[PDB]
């Protein structure tokens, strides 16, 4: 029932994401010189370095807020892809499946801890 445990669990999951080859396109903000129409399509850019910096600054209150920003990385990739068969988008689908498999217990434990605090 530790209300604070989610933070270190999210730091460890971000470390695993950075080691995976499938994160390479998503580690830093999308390069606008490479993709000059990116901001005509994508209203709110997001990347894993931004997520980690937000966490380490103490600017997430819950793992739900971190989970919203990570899902935005994947939805932006889907909106920018010319094909569902693209390389970068296919890396995004494997990395999304890995993320969802590991964040499920972080969310469940946090929400259980809050309910116990309010019992």
Ligand X SMILES: CN1Cc2ccccc2NC1=O
Q: Which residues bind ligand X (CB under 6 A)?
A: 25, 30, 35, 77, 80-81, 86, 88-89
Nearer to ligand X, 41 or 114 (CB): 41
Name the minimum Å distance from CB 88 to ligand X: 4
C-alpha–C-alpha distance, residues 48 and 66, integer Å = 10
Nearer to ligand X, 72 or 107 (CB): 72
Residue 28 three-state SS: coil
Nearer to ligand X, 80 or 98 (CB): 80
Burial zone of 106 (CB within 10 Å; 0-12 exposed, 13-18 middle, 19+ buried): buried
């Amino acid at each position: 029932y530790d209300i604070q445990a989610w933070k270190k669990q999210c730091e460890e999951l971000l470390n695993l994401i950075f080691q995976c080859e499938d994160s390479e396109p998503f580690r830093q903000p999308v390069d606008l010189l490479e993709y000059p129409d990116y901001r005509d399509i994508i209203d709110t850019p997001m990347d894993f370095a931004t997520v980690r910096e937000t966490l380490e600054a103490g600017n997430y209150e819950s793992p739900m807020e971190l989970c919203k920003d990570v899902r935005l990385i994947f939805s932006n990739s889907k909106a920018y892809t010319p094909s569902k068969r693209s390389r970068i988008y296919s890396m995004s689908l494997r990395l999304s499946a890995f993320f969802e498999e590991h964040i499920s217990s972080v969310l469940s434990d946090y929400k259980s801890a809050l309910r116990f605090h309010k019992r």
